[PDB]
Amino acid sequence: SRRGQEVLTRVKQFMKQHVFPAEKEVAEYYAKWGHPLVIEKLKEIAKAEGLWNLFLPAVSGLSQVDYALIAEETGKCFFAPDVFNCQAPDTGNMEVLHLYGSEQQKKQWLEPLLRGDITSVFCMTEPNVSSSDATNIECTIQRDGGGYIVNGKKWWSSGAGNPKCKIAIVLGRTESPSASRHRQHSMILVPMDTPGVELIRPLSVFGYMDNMHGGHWEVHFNHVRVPASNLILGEGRGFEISQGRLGPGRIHHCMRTVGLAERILQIMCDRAVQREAFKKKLYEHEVVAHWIAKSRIAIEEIRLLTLKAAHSIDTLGSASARKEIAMIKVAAPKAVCKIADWAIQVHGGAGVSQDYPLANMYAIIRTLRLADGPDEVHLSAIAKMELQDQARRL
Amino acid sequence: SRRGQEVLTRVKQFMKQHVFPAEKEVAEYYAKWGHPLVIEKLKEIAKAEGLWNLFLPAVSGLSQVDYALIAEETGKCFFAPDVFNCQAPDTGNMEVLHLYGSEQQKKQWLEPLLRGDITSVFCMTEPNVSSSDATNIECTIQRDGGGYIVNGKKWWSSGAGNPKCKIAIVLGRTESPSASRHRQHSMILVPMDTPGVELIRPLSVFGYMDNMHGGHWEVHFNHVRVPASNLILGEGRGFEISQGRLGPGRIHHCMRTVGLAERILQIMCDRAVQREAFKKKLYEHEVVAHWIAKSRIAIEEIRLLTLKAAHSIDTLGSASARKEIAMIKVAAPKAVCKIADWAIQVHGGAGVSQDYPLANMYAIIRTLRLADGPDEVHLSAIAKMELQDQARRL
Amino acid sequence: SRRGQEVLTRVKQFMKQHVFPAEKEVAEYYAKWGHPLVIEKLKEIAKAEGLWNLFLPAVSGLSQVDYALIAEETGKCFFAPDVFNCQAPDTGNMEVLHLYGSEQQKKQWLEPLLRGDITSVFCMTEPNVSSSDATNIECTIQRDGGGYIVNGKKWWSSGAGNPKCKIAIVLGRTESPSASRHRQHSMILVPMDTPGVELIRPLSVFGYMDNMHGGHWEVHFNHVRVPASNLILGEGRGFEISQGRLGPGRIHHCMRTVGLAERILQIMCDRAVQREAFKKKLYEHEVVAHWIAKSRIAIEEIRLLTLKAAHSIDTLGSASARKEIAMIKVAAPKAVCKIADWAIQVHGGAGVSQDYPLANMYAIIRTLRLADGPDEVHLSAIAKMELQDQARRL
Amino acid sequence: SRRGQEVLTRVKQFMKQHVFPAEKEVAEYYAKWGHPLVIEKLKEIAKAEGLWNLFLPAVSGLSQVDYALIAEETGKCFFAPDVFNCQAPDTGNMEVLHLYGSEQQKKQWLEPLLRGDITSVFCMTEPNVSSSDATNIECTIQRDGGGYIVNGKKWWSSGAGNPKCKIAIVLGRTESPSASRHRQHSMILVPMDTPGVELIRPLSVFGYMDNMHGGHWEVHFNHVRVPASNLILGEGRGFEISQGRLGPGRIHHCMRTVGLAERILQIMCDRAVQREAFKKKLYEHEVVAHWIAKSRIAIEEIRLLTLKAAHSIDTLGSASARKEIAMIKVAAPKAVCKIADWAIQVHGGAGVSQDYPLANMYAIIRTLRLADGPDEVHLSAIAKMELQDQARRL
Ligand SMILES: Cc1cc2nc3c(=O)[nH]c(=O)nc-3n(C[C@H](O)[C@H](O)[C@H](O)COP(=O)(O)OP(=O)(O)OC[C@H]3O[C@@H](n4cnc5c(N)ncnc54)[C@H](O)[C@@H]3O)c2cc1C
Ligand SMILES: Cc1cc2nc3c(=O)[nH]c(=O)nc-3n(C[C@H](O)[C@H](O)[C@H](O)COP(=O)(O)OP(=O)(O)OC[C@H]3O[C@@H](n4cnc5c(N)ncnc54)[C@H](O)[C@@H]3O)c2cc1C
Ligand SMILES: Cc1cc2nc3c(=O)[nH]c(=O)nc-3n(C[C@H](O)[C@H](O)[C@H](O)COP(=O)(O)OP(=O)(O)OC[C@H]3O[C@@H](n4cnc5c(N)ncnc54)[C@H](O)[C@@H]3O)c2cc1C
Ligand SMILES: Cc1cc2nc3c(=O)[nH]c(=O)nc-3n(C[C@H](O)[C@H](O)[C@H](O)COP(=O)(O)OP(=O)(O)OC[C@H]3O[C@@H](n4cnc5c(N)ncnc54)[C@H](O)[C@@H]3O)c2cc1C
């Protein structure tokens, strides 16, 4: 679309003018769970210029392909999505509140989230059970008179340490014997200021604490009392809302991963051209050149897959495109992990040190094979859908 | 396009009605370098219905995307491309004669090729040198008074054993010291009936002789006298014509390979559903299901890459899209080889026997990593182009 | 041992003097299920010099390490094991008859097998079921008065087309409700001259019929009447005898595969040194050199694994070393397959043709991942044993 | 040997009694470049019991196989080698001073190193050049009257931050036009207390600073004046001493890596047995079980390769076994990296957090593909030696 191209050009100009020059200051600030003043100034400027809430089609008037290209543009910096209010944790919560939810819930939580006043956290993983299977959730949401009681322990809650975090969406189980085997979980809105909500400890990733994004935390809900109006949809529709939330998050992460892979490839090519070993440059060795070629091929393939998934979501819907989302979720992280490992090996001993962003990049990409579900469950789902498709064809 | 969709539907109906039922008869006939009468009847029927010369846009009025889908449809059978006059050896020669060549050359050779009266063979590989580097060609094309003399030995000439083969395009070298380092080779039209042209022996592929397609032969040119009007373009433009010929052949092969991969995946899924081992079906074992999922992901990726290359050729040109062609040529054969190996392993001991087409399929796909240039030279070319692109960006 | 070293030196001299020069004649003879006179002369010479039955410790007085080195020596030729009476099909049957069996059975069948008068065939695979799980065998061995009745269809029976094949060992099931879940199968000796035994058709491997080794056949047993004295051990001990037969066959195949890999690596290095492409030799390209290095590393690793398994069998026994045999059976075929594929790619288009033995080599190695059980069942067995070992340690 | 077995049993008892229980205290101490008192007490106890300097055959009276098993035992803990005075940085310097060096140098530096009074650091890598090629070293060691002047910048110097570090071995270049192309570098002993030696900054590995081992530092030598008696051997023998130092370090690292891989496999098996997902345990999924089986196979292979290299060094010498050392250096890190990645994936999100040692383990193993030379230079060396061997055979 013409609007998509215009917004993409404006976003590229905004990044090249403001976002990249502030990287050194942002890194020096974090070398303690909030944002420095540079990010707030950038957010104000982006609000002024209209580069705000580009992820939500109902607000920005953009399709999934246009925002796919835009998110590919903003995936080259680790704090750029937060400048445009398109960061990973809160976007899913805004989508959940926009799709499902009452007028009171929207006016109370979605508007401050849209304006950037507050941030949100999504917590559904337990530390003592296998949470890749969503039926293993043991946190309870029991009705107690006129309200609800939330009691459980959470795990890997991203962004809970941010001082602006005021609302949470908690997935817990309700005992409903008369219901089906899937109508046993519900989502509830729990304010972080409610008595009984405790932040236990932050969680590290390969020795990185990720203070820029608020960190990952262990949260305890000790008999938290919540009004009955904070329950999203009904008392047994947690799985449906989770499925609705999942897809867009995965596609946005895949676009950002494509952008990050492009940045990594640029860095690796620069290093290969610059350095000389054994009386020749690094790219003159065929192994490095073949690494570069394979990286380019993989980047092109994953970008095409993500664009296909975005077009399918546009033309059909978010519920009739689960296979494409599963395929891109399987495909992107492994390819970008291989590219990052090749770049680290090309840079040598400096590839693991703090002189380059390759080590933190590798850690973040490595966590992409576990967050939002491991790759094995997605492979099983793809196999099941493919077998159903073959049975229908035959 | 609407015409593309209509022709695709007609082609699908034609295959399902005529081509697949004749597979058993065609296989029994070959269980000796020509075609049985069933193929000739199918060719006559296809000529009547207008499903003729679909590969050439100037004749069929189709873009590269429409024919990409059509060739994906016809890639599921090993003799289907010959039914529609879209077989690998002669298509490149028709493209060469259509792009370059005089009116006399066109009227003499392209029209019988277009009508299907005769077939052609392209020979540029020598047995005693490394022919992956085109500067190693030692066959000579010397001007002798009013004509030319062709003297050399050829290698892996596909389709030379067909009785309908009457014309050849031979790549040889001419001694031109005043010319550049690339203007040393030329292409000449050599009729197979010329004295001095000898067929030495056929060449086998993993123990398969491939009599259906005319086989692969060693050809000797012993002082062949050829008129000066049989030289295509000039006396030093062999490389340019070779580059013009190369790309469309690769893209058509990639589309047919995608179709073959789809057929292989269907066979493997059928076997996995049917068989039971260790008190469960084969797909109930997670390794087989993950094989199926990875095969589907790879098929989708290679199809998207081929469609991207076809669209780029449509919108820009065959000379400004070499990078995409190189990427698809690298990507498709390895993925389809892995899929075929997985299918053979799934079928067990019967995966290598004559009860299934998987072994011949694997042999043919394995030769795709060597024919039309190995994968390593393409990887080097991709690396060079990517480095140039990075230098231009920086 | 000193005897092992002396026999190894004598075997090396015998190969270099007689076996390699006859390769061209043997190949020309087969370019129809028996042996040419050259092989018979070589067998007579080997009998005269005492290089006979080197595989059996009770006859040759050699341990498993000495014969491991000897079989590594004889693995470089495809008919060399038959010169020393150490070929794959009959060796297992000799081991079975030597370990288990009565005096009458030994005097009737093992002595002609030891002298080389007759050959044997082992058949336990069915065409219409999954035979990787041995409980799926549907062939019946019912007691009928004073004898037994064998009724079933066999599959992939190696060596059944040899005119010297006179005896077979057939695995079938007996209905014994009072027995356990494993005491349901038995092995019986069935002469090939018995009425009701039919050879149906030979089976091809990638288009190779393997006439040198007698081929692989489909055999039908149509109500074959057999005396009760032809039953090995008891009526429900088939699994035990099968387990006893399995291990030595696998270790001998692994040693021969190591030898074949060494030959393949020598051929590939010769080609890489000889040829020149793009103004440099093939080994001057780093990819080819890295292929060579990885091939050498893999060869060393698999040889060490096989020697470890042989020493373990020597010092402990064939029943307390199943884990090592499973590991070598998993490890050797994949590494040698990768080496063969690299060599084929190095040779170029000639790597698939009949000018070199690489294509037939690849086909034979590819069948090693399916014969004597697939790799997946061995991986599952290794995982089970490793979990038991960890539980015992903890 | 009997002594080797007795010392191995004593070492196993010592570890199980003292080293493992202190892991929690050691971890809590570091959660600042020296050792806590627990390690010093363990060192005193090990000195009392005679488990001291087990790496040096001239002191312990042990071969390379016995110490290979012992180092495999001590590779399961990250501070265990330091308890027995067998830690990576100083062992190479002790070997260098033991092989080469004068009586004064030995009495001054080797004896305090042997008794554990001081530690050493080896520095030969420069930050601004490619140091994988040893001819790129730009640090200068110029003779200045009665002594030497060392001027250069070092990089990744391990253990320089330890307060006990008093001596260094620096590799620099000397301008000798009359000498050969390899006699251009020399090794000199530089005390850390000499004026002009500066510690610039520590270097991180994936966000880990590794304070336990003294860290990795950037060191500057600003016109350091050193007496002429501190030069090891001559003024142009740096390469020879470097080659002598290299091999034993690699073999010890490989043995410790095998031990670490065994520990990782034990942890992964424990997790797979414990956890349950999708109504079954983790090992009941075939992918996890196949991961376990492949890990066991790889561990066995690398252990056999290391033992073969140790036996070859014992029976022939450290100069006629470079091929085996290169092969093990290539083989061990990649296999252990794959095993560690599989274990991290098995543990899920907790695989990257601080609750388990898998993330730090992966970082340390990942640096093993770069330290002591990258894998690509070793692959090139192996290819060269293999080509020489093939040429000699032919
Ligand atoms: C944990 C750790 C500890 C260390 N400790 C020490 C220490 O105590 N002392 C010390 O002196 N150094 C130490 N180092 C440094 C280490 O020795 C070097 O990083 C390594 O030798 C390579 O040096 P470099 O960084 O200059 O690599 P570079 O040469 O700059 O890397 C270029 C890359 O190109 C590739 N390459 C290079 N040559 C070839 C070729 N011929 N063919 C193909 N590809 C090729 C490789 O992937 C290589 O990594 C340590 C490093 C680490 C990570
Ligand atoms: C060259 C050659 C020679 C042979 N010679 C003989 C001979 O002399 N005698 C004889 O009796 N047989 C012989 N065979 C047959 C051979 O033993 C069988 O092919 C093999 O044992 C598997 O039998 P199948 O074909 O029924 O495999 P199937 O069970 O039908 O194959 C199914 C596939 O599923 C997979 N699979 C199976 N179980 C599992 C599991 N638990 N987990 C995961 N994946 C699994 C495997 O990939 C397997 O290949 C020969 C075969 C070949 C190729
Ligand atoms: C089924 C089939 C059909 C064919 N049909 C035809 C036909 O119709 N017409 C025709 O002219 N030819 C045909 N060929 C031949 C084919 O084009 C050649 O085999 C191919 O181009 C390579 O030629 P070569 O055998 O000389 O390879 P070689 O150059 O001899 O192979 C050397 C090997 O070295 C490697 N290598 C080469 N260059 C590099 C590099 N720069 N970097 C790294 N590695 C490198 C590659 O692995 C290559 O295979 C056919 C081949 C097959 C298998
Ligand atoms: C950086 C990061 C951020 C995160 N942020 C959040 C967040 O904001 N909110 C949140 O709720 N969670 C978050 N998580 C947690 C994440 O969602 C979980 O780690 C993940 O969903 C798996 O949960 P688990 O740890 O219980 O895995 P487990 O189930 O304990 O892992 C077991 C392992 O077994 C394997 N496996 C599982 N099922 C199968 C199967 N069917 N077939 C084969 N293999 C299988 C997989 O390898 C899996 O990793 C985050 C995690 C990370 C690393």
CSV table of C-alpha atoms in Angstrom, one decimal, chain A residues 36-184:
chain,number,residue,atom,x,y,z
A,36,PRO,CA,16.8,6.4,30.6
A,37,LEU,CA,15.6,9.9,29.6
A,38,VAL,CA,16.9,9.4,26.0
A,39,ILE,CA,14.3,6.7,25.4
A,40,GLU,CA,11.5,8.9,26.9
A,41,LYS,CA,12.5,11.8,24.6
A,42,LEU,CA,12.5,9.5,21.6
A,43,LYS,CA,9.0,8.2,22.7
A,44,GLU,CA,7.7,11.8,22.9
A,45,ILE,CA,9.2,12.6,19.5
A,46,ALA,CA,7.6,9.5,17.9
A,47,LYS,CA,4.3,10.4,19.5
A,48,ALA,CA,4.5,13.8,17.9
A,49,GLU,CA,5.3,12.5,14.5
A,50,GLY,CA,2.5,9.8,14.5
A,51,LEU,CA,4.8,6.8,14.6
A,52,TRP,CA,2.8,5.4,17.5
A,53,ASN,CA,1.0,2.0,17.9
A,54,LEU,CA,2.0,0.8,14.4
A,55,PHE,CA,1.3,-2.8,15.4
A,56,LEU,CA,-2.5,-2.4,15.8
A,57,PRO,CA,-4.4,-2.2,12.5
A,58,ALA,CA,-7.4,-0.6,14.2
A,59,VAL,CA,-5.2,2.3,15.3
A,60,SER,CA,-2.6,2.7,12.5
A,61,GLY,CA,-4.8,1.5,9.6
A,62,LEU,CA,-2.1,-0.9,8.3
A,63,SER,CA,-2.2,-4.5,7.1
A,64,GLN,CA,0.1,-7.3,8.3
A,65,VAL,CA,2.4,-7.0,5.3
A,66,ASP,CA,3.1,-3.3,5.9
A,67,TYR,CA,3.7,-3.8,9.6
A,68,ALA,CA,5.8,-6.9,8.7
A,69,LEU,CA,8.2,-4.6,6.7
A,70,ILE,CA,8.1,-2.0,9.4
A,71,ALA,CA,8.9,-4.5,12.2
A,72,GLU,CA,11.7,-5.9,10.0
A,73,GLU,CA,13.0,-2.3,9.9
A,74,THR,CA,12.7,-1.9,13.7
A,75,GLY,CA,14.2,-5.3,14.5
A,76,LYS,CA,17.7,-4.0,13.9
A,77,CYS,CA,17.8,-2.3,17.4
A,78,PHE,CA,17.0,-3.8,20.7
A,79,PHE,CA,15.2,-0.7,22.1
A,80,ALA,CA,13.7,0.6,18.8
A,81,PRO,CA,10.3,-1.3,19.2
A,82,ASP,CA,9.8,0.5,22.6
A,83,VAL,CA,10.3,3.9,20.9
A,84,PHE,CA,7.2,3.2,18.7
A,85,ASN,CA,5.2,1.5,21.5
A,86,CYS,CA,5.5,-1.9,19.8
A,87,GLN,CA,7.4,-3.9,22.4
A,88,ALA,CA,6.8,-7.6,22.9
A,89,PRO,CA,5.2,-8.0,26.3
A,90,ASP,CA,2.6,-5.2,26.2
A,91,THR,CA,1.6,-5.6,22.5
A,92,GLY,CA,0.0,-9.0,23.2
A,93,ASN,CA,-1.9,-7.6,26.2
A,94,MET,CA,-3.2,-4.7,24.1
A,95,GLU,CA,-4.4,-7.2,21.4
A,96,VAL,CA,-6.1,-9.3,24.1
A,97,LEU,CA,-7.9,-6.3,25.6
A,98,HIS,CA,-8.8,-5.0,22.1
A,99,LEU,CA,-10.3,-8.3,20.9
A,100,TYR,CA,-11.9,-9.4,24.1
A,101,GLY,CA,-12.9,-7.4,27.1
A,102,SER,CA,-15.7,-5.1,28.4
A,103,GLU,CA,-16.0,-1.4,27.9
A,104,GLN,CA,-15.0,-0.8,31.6
A,105,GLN,CA,-11.9,-3.0,31.2
A,106,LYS,CA,-10.9,-1.2,27.9
A,107,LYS,CA,-11.4,2.3,29.4
A,108,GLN,CA,-9.5,1.3,32.5
A,109,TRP,CA,-6.5,-0.5,31.1
A,110,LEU,CA,-6.2,-0.4,27.3
A,111,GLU,CA,-6.2,3.4,27.0
A,112,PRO,CA,-3.3,3.9,29.4
A,113,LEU,CA,-1.5,1.1,27.6
A,114,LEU,CA,-2.2,2.7,24.2
A,115,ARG,CA,-0.9,6.1,25.5
A,116,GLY,CA,2.2,4.5,27.0
A,117,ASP,CA,1.4,5.5,30.6
A,118,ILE,CA,1.6,2.0,32.0
A,119,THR,CA,3.1,-1.4,31.0
A,120,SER,CA,1.7,-4.9,31.3
A,121,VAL,CA,3.0,-8.4,32.0
A,122,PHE,CA,1.7,-11.8,30.9
A,123,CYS,CA,2.4,-14.7,33.3
A,124,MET,CA,1.3,-18.3,32.6
A,125,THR,CA,4.4,-20.4,33.3
A,126,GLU,CA,5.0,-22.3,36.5
A,127,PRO,CA,8.5,-23.2,37.8
A,128,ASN,CA,7.8,-26.6,39.2
A,129,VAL,CA,5.9,-28.1,36.3
A,130,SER,CA,6.3,-28.6,32.6
A,131,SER,CA,4.5,-25.5,31.2
A,132,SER,CA,5.0,-26.3,27.5
A,133,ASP,CA,1.8,-28.4,28.0
A,134,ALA,CA,-0.8,-25.8,29.0
A,135,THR,CA,-2.9,-28.4,30.9
A,136,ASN,CA,-0.2,-28.6,33.6
A,137,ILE,CA,-1.0,-25.2,35.0
A,138,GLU,CA,-1.7,-25.5,38.7
A,139,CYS,CA,-2.4,-21.8,39.6
A,140,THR,CA,-6.0,-21.6,40.9
A,141,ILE,CA,-8.6,-18.8,40.3
A,142,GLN,CA,-11.5,-19.6,42.7
A,143,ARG,CA,-14.6,-17.6,43.0
A,144,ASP,CA,-15.0,-16.2,46.5
A,145,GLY,CA,-18.3,-14.5,47.0
A,146,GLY,CA,-18.4,-11.3,44.9
A,147,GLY,CA,-14.9,-11.7,43.6
A,148,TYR,CA,-12.0,-14.1,42.7
A,149,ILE,CA,-9.0,-15.5,44.6
A,150,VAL,CA,-5.7,-16.0,42.7
A,151,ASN,CA,-3.2,-18.3,44.3
A,152,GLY,CA,-0.1,-19.6,42.6
A,153,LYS,CA,3.6,-19.1,41.6
A,154,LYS,CA,4.7,-17.7,38.3
A,155,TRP,CA,7.9,-17.9,36.4
A,156,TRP,CA,9.8,-16.0,33.6
A,157,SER,CA,7.4,-13.1,33.8
A,158,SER,CA,8.9,-10.6,31.4
A,159,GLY,CA,8.8,-6.9,32.3
A,160,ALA,CA,7.5,-7.3,35.8
A,161,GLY,CA,10.4,-5.3,37.3
A,162,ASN,CA,9.6,-2.1,35.3
A,163,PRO,CA,8.3,0.6,37.7
A,164,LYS,CA,5.6,1.4,35.1
A,165,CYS,CA,4.1,-2.1,35.3
A,166,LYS,CA,0.7,-1.8,36.9
A,167,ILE,CA,-1.5,-4.6,35.3
A,168,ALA,CA,-1.1,-8.3,34.7
A,169,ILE,CA,-2.9,-11.0,32.8
A,170,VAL,CA,-2.7,-14.3,34.8
A,171,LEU,CA,-3.6,-17.7,33.5
A,172,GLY,CA,-4.9,-20.1,36.1
A,173,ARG,CA,-7.2,-23.1,36.4
A,174,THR,CA,-10.8,-23.3,37.7
A,175,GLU,CA,-12.4,-26.5,38.9
A,176,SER,CA,-15.3,-27.1,36.5
A,177,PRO,CA,-16.2,-30.8,36.5
A,178,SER,CA,-19.3,-30.2,34.3
A,179,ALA,CA,-17.1,-28.5,31.6
A,180,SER,CA,-15.0,-30.1,28.9
A,181,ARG,CA,-11.3,-31.0,29.1
A,182,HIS,CA,-10.2,-27.6,27.7
A,183,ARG,CA,-12.6,-25.3,29.5
A,184,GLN,CA,-10.6,-25.5,32.7
